[PDB]
């Protein structure tokens, strides 16, 4: 019950997470009240324990520069690889790739993963 019934609107409303001081000593001054939409669109339950989803394929590995917590050389390397791929395909994007007018000729841009 992270939502409250409103008598003026006669409906459930809510606001963003707020601290105890603001909830208690500024309950009269409440801003940005949004009608409660429900946890799920169909009214089912959403209370589940979550975990880590499977990882994604890597084109430029992080292990090239992994001793460094700050990723600056890795950032440069990955951007350079993406820029090579883009220089290959940059002008064909609107005719053979994501930016086509019709979905019939839609293809994923080859540099999406590197980007």
């Amino acid at each position: 019950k992270c939502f409250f019934f409103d008598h003026g609107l006669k409906k459930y409303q809510m606001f963003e997470p707020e601290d105890m001081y603001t909830v208690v000593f500024e309950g009269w001054a409440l801003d940005d009240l949004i009608t409660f939409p429900g946890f799920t669109p169909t009214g089912r339950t959403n209370s589940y324990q979550i975990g880590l989803s499977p990882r994604q394929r890597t084109v430029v590995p992080t292990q090239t520069f992994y001793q460094m917590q700050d990723y600056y050389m890795l950032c440069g390397l990955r951007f350079e690889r993406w820029f090579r791929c883009d220089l290959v395909y940059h002008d064909q994007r609107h005719t053979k790739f994501d930016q086509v007018k019709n979905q019939k000729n839609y293809k994923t841009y080859p540099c999406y993963r590197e980007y």
């Binding site: 989803s53 994604q56 394929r57 994501d98 930016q99 994923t108 841009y109 999406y112």
Partner: protein, 51 residues
């Protein structure tokens, strides 16, 4: 929902399309009309043909 980067990219190309449209319209209008010069802008230095 399986979030493989190709399926995710298919999901996210529409939002990227709208954001790119907004950015490119703003770019064209403001940036190009306020900065660029059209039709081979150049500085002309005349000289009189001496006697």
């Amino acid at each position: 929902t399986f979030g493989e980067l190709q399926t995710a990219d298919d999901y996210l190309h529409v939002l990227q399309l709208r954001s790119q449209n907004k950015w490119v319209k703003n770019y064209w209008n403001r940036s190009l009309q306020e900065t660029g010069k059209t039709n081979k802008a150049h500085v002309i230095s005349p000289q009189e043909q001496l006697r």
